[PDB]
Amino acid sequence: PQITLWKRPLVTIKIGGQLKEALLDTGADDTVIEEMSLPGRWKPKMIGGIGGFIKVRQYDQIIIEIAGHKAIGTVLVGPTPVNIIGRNLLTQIGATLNF
Amino acid sequence: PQITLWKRPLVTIKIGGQLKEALLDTGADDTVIEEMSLPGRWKPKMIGGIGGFIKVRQYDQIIIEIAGHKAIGTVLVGPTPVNIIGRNLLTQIGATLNF
Ligand SMILES: CC(C)CN(C[C@@H](O)[C@H](Cc1ccccc1)NC(=O)O[C@H]1CO[C@H]2OCC(F)(F)[C@H]21)S(=O)(=O)c1ccc(N)cc1
Ligand SMILES: [Cl-]
Ligand SMILES: [Cl-]
Ligand SMILES: [Cl-]
Ligand code: NA
């Protein structure tokens, strides 16, 4: 689709068997999701933000479905105020900014 | 143009006759730029992200060029880690997300 930016670009995702709403965020290098369980190994990470950092768990090789499109990549899990789909997974669904 | 997301979507902006680099950020409601001098009065605003909130100065009806496209609108100034072009000005330059 073509998504205008008059409102937040929110979409439905499927991750870990769960449906969630997430923000398509070209200003995010990586994907960050609110606390949930995911399978496999993880390692700690700090991720930056406009106001400072939060501690997250880094899970690699996680499959997500993003508005109907399957991707695989790293997902960070931690106390983000909103679920955000970052560039690491936006590239995989072929998302571009056009003007 | 059509901007892919394998790297950060950084463009040149021009504000107060100065060139700066800024990130095109669909996850930002608001344009926020690092400390600089802007004309006129400002109003207070609170904006929040990963790591919490920052206090910013809101300047309205500021002339800003973004990747060669003219915009005139609200610019927030504060301790953001990078200059961010948010949806309030992305809509003025006709940007959409596409996949
Ligand atoms: C700051 C920017 C360089 C990076 N961020 C992504 C942003 O898109 C962020 C994404 C974001 C969205 C919503 C809440 C938290 C973060 N938006 C944001 O801070 O926008 C602020 C300016 O306008 C307001 O609108 C949303 C806001 F946050 F409120 C304010 S981020 O959230 O800090 C971030 C950093 C690293 C990773 N991997 C993922 C995300
Ligand atoms: Cl990845
Ligand atoms: Cl104040
Ligand atoms: Cl505006
Ligand atoms: Na894994």
Curated annotation (Swiss-Prot), chains A, B:
* General function of this protein: Aspartyl protease that mediates proteolytic cleavages of Gag and Gag-Pol polyproteins during or shortly after the release of the virion from the plasma membrane. Cleavages take place as an ordered, step-wise cascade to yield mature proteins. This process is called maturation. Displays maximal activity during the budding process just prior to particle release from the cell. Also cleaves Nef and Vif, probably concomitantly with viral structural proteins on maturation of virus particles. Hydrolyzes host EIF4GI and PABP1 in order to shut off the capped cellular mRNA translation.
Q: Which residues form the active site?
A: 25
State the protein's name. Protease
* UniProt-annotated stretches for the region Dimerization of protease: 1-5, 49-55, 88-99
Domain of life from the UniProt record: Viruses
Q: Where is the Peptidase A2 domain?
A: 20-89
The entry describes its oligomerization and partners as:
Homodimer, whose active site consists of two apposed aspartic acid residues.
- Its gene? gag-pol
Shown residues within the full chain: 501 to 599 of 1447
